Chain length 229, copies 6
Amino acid sequence: IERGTILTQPGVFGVFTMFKLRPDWNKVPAMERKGAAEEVKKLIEKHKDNVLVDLYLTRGLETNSDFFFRINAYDLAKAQTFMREFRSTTIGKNADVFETLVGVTKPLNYISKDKSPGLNAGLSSATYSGPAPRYVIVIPVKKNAEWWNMSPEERLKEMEVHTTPTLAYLVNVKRKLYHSTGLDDTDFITYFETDDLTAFNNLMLSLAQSPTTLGTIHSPEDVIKALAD
Amino acid sequence: ERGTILTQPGVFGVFTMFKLRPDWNKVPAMERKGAAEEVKKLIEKHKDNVLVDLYLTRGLETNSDFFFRINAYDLAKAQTFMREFRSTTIGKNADVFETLVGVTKPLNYISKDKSPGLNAGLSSATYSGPAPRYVIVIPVKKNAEWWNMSPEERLKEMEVHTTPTLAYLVNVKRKLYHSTGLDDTDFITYFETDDLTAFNNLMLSLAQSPTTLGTIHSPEDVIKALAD
Amino acid sequence: KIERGTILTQPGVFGVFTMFKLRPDWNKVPAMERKGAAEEVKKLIEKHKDNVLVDLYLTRGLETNSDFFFRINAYDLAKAQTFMREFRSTTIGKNADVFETLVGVTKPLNYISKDKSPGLNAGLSSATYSGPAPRYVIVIPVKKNAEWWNMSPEERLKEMEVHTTPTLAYLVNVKRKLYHSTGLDDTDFITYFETDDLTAFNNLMLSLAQSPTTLGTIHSPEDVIKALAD
Amino acid sequence: IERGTILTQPGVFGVFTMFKLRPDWNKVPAMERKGAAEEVKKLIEKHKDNVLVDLYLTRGLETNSDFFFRINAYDLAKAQTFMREFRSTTIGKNADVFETLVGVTKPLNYISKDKSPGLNAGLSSATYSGPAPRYVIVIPVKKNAEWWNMSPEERLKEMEVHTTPTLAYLVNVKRKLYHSTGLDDTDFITYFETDDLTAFNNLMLSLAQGSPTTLGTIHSPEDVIKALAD
Amino acid sequence: KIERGTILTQPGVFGVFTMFKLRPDWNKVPAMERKGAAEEVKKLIEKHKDNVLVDLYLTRGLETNSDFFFRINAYDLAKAQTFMREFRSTTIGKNADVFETLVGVTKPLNYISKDKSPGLNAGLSSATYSGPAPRYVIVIPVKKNAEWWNMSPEERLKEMEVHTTPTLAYLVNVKRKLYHSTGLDDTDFITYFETDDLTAFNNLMLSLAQSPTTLGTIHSPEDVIKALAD
Amino acid sequence: KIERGTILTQPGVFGVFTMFKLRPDWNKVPAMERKGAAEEVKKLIEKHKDNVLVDLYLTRGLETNSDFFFRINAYDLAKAQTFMREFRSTTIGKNADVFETLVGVTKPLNYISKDKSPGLNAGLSSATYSGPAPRYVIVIPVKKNAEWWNMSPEERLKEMEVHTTPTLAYLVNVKRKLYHSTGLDDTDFITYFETDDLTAFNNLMLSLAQTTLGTIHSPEDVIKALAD
Ligand code: HEM
Ligand code: HEM
Ligand code: HEM
Ligand code: HEM
Ligand code: HEM
Ligand code: HEM
């Protein structure tokens, strides 16, 4: 598993699990809590060849969660095994699952070279340029009957409308699409990274013209350390 | 056995989704490590009564950690197995999230008689992948507009349903149970695949009912995974 | 005197249906105390042999929201109440929550009578259950809407004739019993079915299609309690 | 306070409180439980010049309650005091309030001698002729904006439609109307007693051609509590 | 300093209404601790003699969702907050949950003023309460919909004249006080009533017919607490 | 480094609003531990002097669903998050549930700018707050519907001019601050008001028609009020 490769390929599974710490986490012995970070660190190293692990901090920014994982894997069952084993961890045993989202990466359906070459070239010509992102946004999306009724040609035109004002934001915002229909009770999981939350608000407003999860990006052991305190 | 019962009409399916109680972690480790054997013995005890499938959802689902599919010629035998499972060490430490009851039936619409072309397509398509690693279960309830329609109208719609889905039969196994009158839904749809991208594409094909996604294992392995 | 064949066949008979869900602390009841629960219930039913008819059904393993339910039939509703109240004082009764209680009363035919609908009435009499002893029970409470009650008696009779036409055939393999609940409970009817053939029942419901369903199995009361004590 | 007088006068307050026994009632020492009936009996006697007290048994017939009181009083504050004091009682401390309904008795608004003499005469010529009633029914009723929009003349005609088929039932169903608008979150509390629940089902169907129904049995207060101590 | 007859009669006065329900563990508070609760509240009110006007009302025995409620009037809302916060630290305050909190301010007449509606305004002044001291309180919060706010001032005035016309008659029997809440709370108005005659109040509401209601009884604060300690 | 008068005045500033309700077990915390809670919070705010601006408000006695709330302003949202998470590890923080969390960012004028609406923009500049320091705070989150977002920019501008016209008068008595939330939270705006005159605020809301209410104190005073 190489981070730069797996995050770039079709057919990759994404499993997103949002956790809320149970009230009795405060009652776990401080020493046992202080060992939780290293336990998680070792679990991630144990699964180094199995899955890519991202862990984000939402505590202080979200009412319904304290942290969430994004697991990427070529084999969904490996993602499942990691998540299952995390739940047997000291902190895992003291956290409720708020939300679990399963999706899979796919090739471009609409804005491809063949179907929409102008906007496709814009998609490739745009490259992220600021500092390493501090922030993550996850938004699941379910499309309605009206969307699915539409012809492929009509949906392509709508996706060209989607893509036109959003290309400018790629210098500032990283995006990643996972597809969920049949795998979960949603159609897509949209995933964003940014250092510039004002740009992200402008992006969303450009699009306006679900449950949002906002968190911060850290090493997994730092996230756990922040939750042990 | 397995190959026969999963292939006949008049066969009952009982799907029960379980969520481990928080006090499962508090069960002594030795008692938890004996849970798998206990379930294995119960299944062997009912070898001549029911077919048992047990699946792992923990790590992929918020609302369940495992679920059973029981197939039986006699519904009461499926009930007996499920009740006895719930008296098991792990069973006593799990809440029932969902219970679905349905029965297998002959083809209503895409039969040789009513729809010979698509019926032939249904028979000529054969699963060609490796042993499936994933299971999907989706209960379906149809609305009054569906039931209002004529048999001919419903047939036309089922022909629309079948047309784009035949392609996926090489890649995805499907099994239909009928539930009207037996439960608070109309159908239980059941799928196995090794290729979840294919399954996603299949559902999208149809788009153009809460979903349970789990993983296929031997029963003792599922319990072993939950004991840890 | 309660004769099963007589009481289940008369008008003015009260039905009380109570669905129970075992509390989590039932597993914590000493195993010997649990093993004595069946006999306690058996004796209670015996005690009330002249007061009420008792049916007890097993729903555990088939239903999320209940483990068992009673159907009590009685000439005197107060007697059904007394039995149910005394059941809740039993070992198993003390360890079970009430999920649902339905009260209804048996009545003469309102629509498909000799007088109003003689053809279909004759079909109702000529149809006889011919299967083995039923293994399965289905209970469905029904509330009718404003539109139904708005309709004329003549319009409601025509609809009941529509209801009866495709269902007569199913009487060879499905037993039915109607209770009327309006004013006695928050529903209008309790419908009650017995069958050995759940494929026939699914077909029956589909024939009709063209509130919540309780499915259970029929056993002696002590067998149901024994099954729950394990 | 005279039962026959207070139940027959305008300006009389009704307070209905439905109670559900808490799970820890079973854990109350059996002798403490067996003393509960006498405690309630003495409270009722202490208030014999303050309020009329009725207590009814719903356990075994209702999911959401085990018993309920109807308190009648000339003075509402006295009904409040009794109920408060009941809640301090051994059984009162082990019971949750499911529902509280407050209403007041009033003169005839519609079917009066002046406004509807024919039906008014029928109302007075009908007399309850059954045995002492064993069953109570309570149904709260809230009317909608359409009702209140209607003219007094239109509402009177509707009330004449209400009364026409129901007069027949007065030989075996007792009725009492309380008015609740402004006093509670409903418009009326309807209260019925009968020995014949078949007739009551027929009555409600006659009418059919916000409102949860409470069905219970009529007993002495001490017998209701004794039944609940068991 | 604060005079009851003055502050209850001025614009710009804040009302804070807080409805409390006793926690189950109130019964478990030592009896002597509970019997000292009344004096503790009495002293708190005395402490804030110059800060707020305090009314306390008993709803237990009449309401499912509350046992008592306060109405605090004050020139300074922050002082009403301070009292309520300090009450919540009392023995009984520590053993009660807040069910509802309503905040409003008193204002001059918007509609039925001398300038806008002189006839009805004169009727408003010429009517005075003539009963015995009121024993009963009613509180009803009111939220008006978009249709109301869309209407012109002239249209709203005409509606308020419709409101006032039949209600003037009831001012001999019913005290009224209006608080305005828009922006301060999630409702538009807090309406407050006192009466000794609940039949008149029912008649009044029916006159108007042609949110949730809280009914309680008026007492000294110490008597209300004493009533809850028992 | 952070200056109150500066950070409250700039675009690109993040606001984090978190409403807390004290757990029933707060009364069971030893009185001396409760009495030290105020200084603990004071020290935490001091430690983050250069990272965030902290406002703490008292809602106990005025709200059913909360006892206190924070408004954190910061150039860096992550620093607001750090303060809030460290607050939650405090003695009082450990004994309070989060009822509500609102995230937003400050932005330049979108509608009532000099360019787009010069007359009303001038009125915005000319109406200033007078009178005593505000005693009261009001926070109202706002989500706009699909009808709003499908309107043209011109149509939305006209609406915002309708919004601004009767509200200018209230700026002598009410301070206002807008935060933008779309994409950062499940709402579109966080509106924030301070006033000493709640009658004026009532009239303002009524003018618009044609909610969290709290009181402003130093952070240690709010905590001291809650320790009692
Ligand atoms: C950062 C700027 C963005 C760019 C450049 C962008 C571009 C695109 C492109 C090119 C696709 C087509 C994928 C394909 O061909 O299969 C797509 C799909 C999609 N986008 Fe974005 N997007 C952006 C931001 C967003 C945001 C903020 C959302 C809101 C959650 C969003 C929601 C979606 C969804 C739900 C789809 C799948 C649509 C479908 O296949 O039916 N996007 N986007
Ligand atoms: C794997 C590819 C699939 C194929 C080849 C297929 C084919 C069929 C056929 C031939 C029938 C008619 C059975 C009869 O005549 O009685 C049917 C029924 C049905 N299918 Fe599928 N199907 C597929 C996937 C799916 C999926 C993904 C769903 C979504 C949950 C679904 C939902 C249903 C339902 C609810 C019925 C019962 C319809 C009714 O009787 O009204 N199917 N399918
Ligand atoms: C087993 C086959 C069935 C037969 C032969 C049958 C026949 C009848 C007849 C003759 C009546 C009218 C009795 C009268 O005149 O008073 C009736 C009533 C009724 N049936 Fe069935 N039925 C069958 C199955 C069902 C099923 C499966 C349901 C669904 C729950 C159902 C629901 C009802 C209801 C709610 C009524 C009350 C009608 C009313 O008085 O408004 N029936 N049935
Ligand atoms: C037992 C046979 C019944 C008779 C003889 C009867 C008769 C009457 C009469 C004469 C009135 C008008 C009282 C007046 O003028 O102020 C009335 C009112 C009313 N009745 Fe009945 N009734 C009967 C049963 C029922 C039943 C079963 C209900 C259903 C719950 C019911 C609901 C009501 C309600 C809600 C009102 C108040 C109507 C209003 O003033 O808006 N009654 N009844
Ligand atoms: C006791 C007899 C009553 C009289 C004489 C009366 C009279 C009035 C008057 C004169 C006003 C106008 C205040 C102004 O100009 O600012 C008013 C407002 C109002 N009244 Fe009453 N009222 C009575 C009872 C009631 C009742 C029973 C309710 C129902 C809860 C009620 C609800 C309201 C409300 C919500 C307003 C504010 C309306 C608004 O400003 O939009 N009133 N009343
Ligand atoms: C105190 C007097 C007020 C004045 C002078 C005022 C003025 C303004 C102005 C000029 C804008 C446009 C900002 C821009 O152009 O980007 C605005 C936006 C907004 N105001 Fe107010 N306002 C006041 C009170 C209120 C109140 C009481 C509320 C109710 C909660 C409110 C809700 C909003 C909202 C939600 C927006 C965002 C609108 C959008 O961009 O779609 N305002 N206000």
